[PDB]
Amino acid sequence: RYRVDLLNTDHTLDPSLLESGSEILGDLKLQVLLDEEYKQLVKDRKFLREVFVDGEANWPLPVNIRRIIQNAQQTFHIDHTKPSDLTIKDIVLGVKDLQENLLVLRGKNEII
């Protein structure tokens, strides 16, 4: 599901999915970014398997993701053919942007 390897063979993306995807095949910087977020995800997987011994998927949580991206699809009318105008750089920075921008506790000190 999640392994992407921009210079290797088996888990390589199809460059029909991105216009700026053919030429970047083999770039070191993008590969380093993908590998470090991959390591982030696998350490998260280890953490979750620790904090639930059973392996239950369904859990109570705040705001849904599935339906909100579903209505995003059906409002901005995605097609089945056009490679997106996205960049890997934009995605991997914007997720960490939103990650810090979630703000529950206003404060300044180390403990907060």
Partner 1 sequence: HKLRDQVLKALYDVLAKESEHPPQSILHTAKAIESEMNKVNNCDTNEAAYKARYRIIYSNVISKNNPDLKHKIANGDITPEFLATCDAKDLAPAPLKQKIEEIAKQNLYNAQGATIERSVTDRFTCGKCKEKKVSYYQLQTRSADEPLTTFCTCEACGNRWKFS
Partner 2 sequence: VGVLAAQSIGEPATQMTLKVTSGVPRLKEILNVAKNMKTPSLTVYLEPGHAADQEQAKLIRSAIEHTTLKSVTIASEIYYDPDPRSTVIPEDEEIIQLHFSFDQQSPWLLRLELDRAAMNDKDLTMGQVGERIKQTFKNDLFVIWSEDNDEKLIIRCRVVRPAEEDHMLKKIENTMLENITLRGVENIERVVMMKYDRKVPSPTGEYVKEPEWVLETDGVNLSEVMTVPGIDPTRIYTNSFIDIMEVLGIEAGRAALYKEVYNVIASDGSYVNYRHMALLVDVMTTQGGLTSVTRHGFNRSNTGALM
Partner 3 sequence: DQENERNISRLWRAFRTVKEMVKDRGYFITQEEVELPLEDFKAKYCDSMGRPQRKMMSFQANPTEESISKFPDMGSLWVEFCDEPSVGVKTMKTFVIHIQEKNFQTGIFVYQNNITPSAMKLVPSIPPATIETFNEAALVVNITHHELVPKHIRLSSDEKRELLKRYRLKESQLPRIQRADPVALYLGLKRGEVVKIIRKSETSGRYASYRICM
**Binding residues vs partner 1 (CB under 8 A):** 56-58
Task: Choose from partner 1, partner 3, partner 2, none: what does 49 bind? Cβ within 5-8 Å by kind.
Answer: partner 2
Nearer to partner 2, 60 or 107 (CB): 60
Does position 109 interact with partner 3 (CB under 8 A)? The reply is: yes
CA dist., res. 63 & res. 19, Å (int)? 33
Does position 99 interact with partner 3 (CB under 8 A)? The reply is: no
Say if CB 15 and CB 25 are below 8 A apart: yes
CA dist., res. 84 & res. 73, Å (int)? 13
